[PDB]
Symmetry: D2
Subunit: 325 residues, 4 copies
């Protein structure tokens, strides 16, 4: 049966779409490294991750062809063999295209779709609500994760929006950014598992330990031991009341991320979202993300250095926390 | 042979993609009214327009299926029979998809593509330049019109960008908005026919009468006599030095547009770009644009009233200027 | 001797600058109701508040004359008679004016200044840091509360800024808005008592109960019992581990604030910051804030209704929580 | 008696507030170089400028003390001796402070005030309109130049605002930025002399030669011959129909300004508005602007280089056009 919020716990990792060496060239047509895809999936399951998300911004939902996406999702589904939940990404420029893609990828065997909103024209609240209702009506078997990124999708995903989404049974989770309004969003949307970023999980879990049981991780693509440790230590802390160890892991994570954003700026990061994440993963050496598909294959050198430093820092964390596991 | 800037003169009208009555429903699959398409094309040629653009924002490039686009462009090309230049629109989320679509629509018989930039991730200057170079390399037979809309495409199309575009022979024109930096852009980009909006044509033509010989018009979809008269009166004024009559037409146009934008605000208009343009055309009664494809089918009633008033004002202008022609 | 972060605990209320009936007129010259000022101060001390802040945005730091500010602060200082800490506000267009005002108001007997940054030209990080260092050097006896409002002061008060402020001994507290980055800011700035807004206190206190012991309140000007109850119930929760009662108070507060912002929008609220706060306090009836000084005396009627509803809601909370005290 | 739009023609130059060597120090109290002020004024009148504006953003309206402003304006007024119109700047955080300052500086002998809006809280249209009406009621002898800078003052000065300002007789001119909506603003506000930036004067004058007869210039502080030449050549072109020479001057000006903005970006320039203008003038060597008053005395080195290059370019233009003038 379909996933619910009750089924969403622990560490959910967002994987890249590994690319072949020629992927930056507009002439290339089959740019997904399907063997590297399979290898990453198995490594994540083996590390003990609770679920897998894919095909967000740095996963290059925007730049893959439809044939590449089908092949990618097929490979993932055959590798996973039902062992963990998997969400693909079907964000597109309009409702009909989203529905067409969501239908095919759910049929191939994904459990759900991580879904932003069409972003050529900026959506208002009623448009966005109707969009998610439309997709849920059209594809009732699919679980939905709201991909709540205002930089990418222009819409700001405000409080009343969450109240409306809690009425759609298919909407079970959200990839959430800043936790500034999380206390309230939880109240407005009781039926949604809100996933903070890993760096914010410690804080969010302390705010509401009953509701905040899961988080999403990009840093896991540099070695997942850090995320696994955080998950485990937060479960222990909720039981014992001793938060010191979880706090120390959380502080390490924030430090590893400290050079990732160009000049500290989320909006400047968002212009180079794809290249910076991929350069980071490449530097950490746990997986081979490969070059970026056009048009987003140019990143200033200064910024790359920051991303590479972050990668090396996360790889160091993976080494440290692998021993403590 | 391929169009150049020298071939771009006079009144270029941007047509909507007429929709069938069920087009707001995500279930509908063939939502283009192809007969209304053909009728509009013939009416525009008969009014004396110099060229046709299509499939921008209000033309619903974003919300049409690929099958609907081929049928639309086929219909237009068969109706036009080579009598005027025609540009389709192929803006998409990535370079490979843009190239695939531009190839097919040029093969069907469009002369060129009105092309924005991929907008999921905000582009920087080098990314955008490389994007247009890539499309021009991939599809050298196609003329390109830069669709320079920062609200839609996030990128701001700055001065150095125009300098780069003037080096691409395929780039022959630009749908341009505010004329604040037009004097300089003309200097930086000698090989491009910059098309101001009809309301700005009078001013732009006075700044540089040798270079500013053409403009784009949405208001023509409410009755093209106003645009034809402006074109004709500006040709006369350049010759005689008497600008009074062109100025009076230009002032009428600005007044007709004065209620279109919600609270005077371009960014608020841009959220409802599609519904407001279509509601305006519907109110004017010269053509039947029809309902908007999902997800952009909800517009606040206050704003619609302003768009409808604008439509009625343009229809009045069409009546007045039809007599003077 | 000078306040430190260790001295800042509990409920800190931000008072308005009560105005006489002619205060909206640019001709009026002594528009502070000094008796109402004294009455509010005594009522707040009698309610048990831990400290008083004044002369931020809605306190009309911007629109008071220098004579009005001296009389206001004199009245407050003579009413307080040393019983609680008091911070005035000395934000101005430049460093020398800030220093001149801070010197005089500290001499009159304020303990410190709630200080934003000059905002005609937008400050960068080094400029802002040097500004606060300059004021602290010039007026070493004054405690400083950073007034971290990006809408008012344009500067965004980013993470590295807090690291720098923790090196200035005079900087002991901050009026802080969204708590999205609070976990990290606390780490970067060990010597600062960060004051969340009352609505965010519950969440912030759960994140870091050792560091988050105080908050600021505007809602207390509608009746302070709600803030006093929250303070008291959070001290018990920290001891017992039972957060249910604190959560219920916090939820009531969020509901009372729910109609305050025009269309939910902080930036739209910020255009009418002064009129909306004053209209709210006037509606609650616990104090008489009076009309706004020019130029900020015009607020759309729709928005006023929302502010008045909020006022009535806070007055209801004051009634309820007065009984439970 | 009071200036009207009919009196506003030609080249209006915006002067800095020259500072003494210790002016970056918060301890310093009389940081205006009054002799350099007088020297600049006389040089501008001698160059043939039509009017002088002062105390905008780079003029450091924000960072001068009240005593400094009075001495500055006194010096200017006594140097000018009625020979050209002069506008001071009285933008402040509220209406009463603006009125107090405008009264005193008009009494000292300025003809008018270049006035933005209070910017702690962002103004809406009705607030802004009422603000300019109050200052005009309070100080009816003062001419007003609207300082229409959205970066500094947050308000965007939209079309309906101009319609309202054209009803205030005291409002006679505007320091205007982008000319994208100028055609319309002229129609909405018949009684205002809109001053485009010098780089946009060529274009604006061609759009509406009857209404666009004046412009404002910061580049003149690097040597005013360029602005004087542009004024003169545009007068000639309106009469002859030959615009080639005016266009060439305008193109030179745009090139001289091309490195001024950090990364081409008006908003990034606006963070360093004061330091960059002063560094540019210092590099050109026609006047000594001096250091910036606190807090705005720190500018990244990369950006300074661009401003200095711009200064040298404008100084080169001044040399070239000084020869062509006579």
């Amino acid at each position: 049966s379909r996933l619910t919020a009750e089924d969403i716990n622990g560490a959910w990792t967002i994987m890249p779409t590994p690319s072949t060496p020629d992927a930056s060239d507009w002439r290339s047509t089959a740019t997904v490294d399907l063997e590297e895809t399979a290898r990453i999936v198995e490594e994540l399951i083996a590390a003990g991750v609770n679920g897998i998300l894919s095909m967000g911004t740095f996963g290059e939902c925007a730049t893959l062809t439809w044939d590449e996406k089908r092949d990618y999702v097929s490979t993932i589904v055959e590798t996973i063999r039902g062992r963990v939940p998997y969400f693909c990404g079907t964000t597109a420029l309009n409702t009909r295209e989203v529905i067409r893609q969501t239908r095919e990828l759910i049929d191939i065997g994904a459990n759900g779709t991580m879904l932003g909103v069409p972003m050529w024209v900026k959506m208002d609240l009623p448009t966005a609500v109707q969009f998610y209702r439309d997709v849920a009506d059209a594809v009732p078997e699919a679980a939905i994760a709201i991909y709540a990124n205002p930089e990418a999708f222009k819409f700001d995903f405000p409080r009343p929006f969450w109240a409306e989404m809690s009425k759609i049974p298919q909407v079970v989770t959200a990839k959430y950014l800043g936790i500034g309004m999380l206390d309230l969003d939880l109240r407005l949307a009781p039926n949604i598992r809100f996933l903070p970023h890993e760096d914010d999980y410690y804080a969010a879990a302390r705010i509401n330990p009953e509701r905040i049981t899961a988080f999403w991780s990009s840093g896991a693509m540099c070695g997942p031991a850090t995320a696994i440790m955080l998950r485990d230590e937060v479960v222990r802390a909720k039981s014992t009341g001793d938060w010191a160890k979880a706090k120390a892991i959380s502080d390490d994570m924030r430090a590893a991320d400290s050079t990732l954003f160009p000049r500290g700026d989320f909006s400047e990061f968002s212009k180079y979202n794809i290249g910076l994440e991929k350069a980071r993963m490449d530097a950490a050496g746990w997986l081979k993300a490969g070059p970026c598909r056009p048009p987003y294959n140019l990143v200033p050198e200064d910024y790359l250095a920051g991303a590479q430093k972050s990668g090396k820092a996360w790889a160091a964390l993976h080494a440290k926390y692998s021993n403590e596991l």
